[PDB]
């Protein structure tokens with residue numbers, strides 16, 4: 645794996661090592677708000693993060709992941725388009741070099757400054773590695789970030805980034821409550837898609853919240869001081885780690901709201 649986000653290893657190159665990059669259910673996509681249709685078959689969405697147990701934060705050279713204890717049903721996502729129980733394993737973000745870009749999904753071609761992905765796996769498949777081989781293996785809850793007021797619940801994340809500046813660095817990150825990253829409304833769009841990085845597996849039910857959260861310019865400037873490189877290597881700022889919108893093909897985006 646030498647994929648990344650540069651001119652020579654970025655999204656336009658991924659197909660050569662990951663041919664599913666040109667597949668029939670790739671993510672992200674543009675959400676055309678006028679074409680998305682309210683779906684009365686959707687059950688109420690249930691985000692149950694009361695017992696979430698965060699463990700560690702890791703710079704993986706592509707983003708940073710806040711990882712959770714997923715050895716039992718502690719933080720789960722259920723309902724909406726989902727059949728059964730999906731366990732939270734990690735969250736991460738995608739962001740830009742400037743405030744007008746960074747999200748992976750777009751809304752009527754609008755790009756947000758960043759996008760939060762809370763990744764969950766379907767417990768009927770027993771472990772994450774089995775779940776990613778299944779068309780309904782994962783559920784990713786996507787939340788847009790706009791630059792405005794600070795998000796108080798983000799600042800514990802922002803303040804540890806200095807300790808994980810480079811690829812392969814991790815830090816203990818216990819007792820973080822991901823409920824502080826949610827907007828007030830759980831109105832959402834949903835469609836079948838993929839992981840947005842290699843290996844681009846078509847295993848994700850995407851649930852993208854309509855209401856962005858606001859973060860401050862200072863908060864997102866701290867994301868942009870991270871590094872794609874390892875320690876001791878030439879500094880390459882971790883910015884623009886987003887895949888652009890992919891063809892919708894034979895898919896419909898469903899809305900939870902009238």
Ligand SMILES: NS(=O)(=O)c1ccc(NC(=O)CN2C(=O)NC3(CCCCC3)C2=O)cc1
Nearest residue numbers: 761763772773776784838839840841842843
């Ligand atoms: N942007 S995204 O679509 O939300 C998205 C994109 C890529 C990924 N990639 C992965 O999770 C890659 N990956 C595996 O396959 N296995 C582990 C998790 C389980 C333990 C072993 C390591 C892992 O980290 C996740 C979400």
Ligand SMILES: [Zn+2]
Nearest residue numbers: 736738761840
């Ligand atoms: Zn992601």
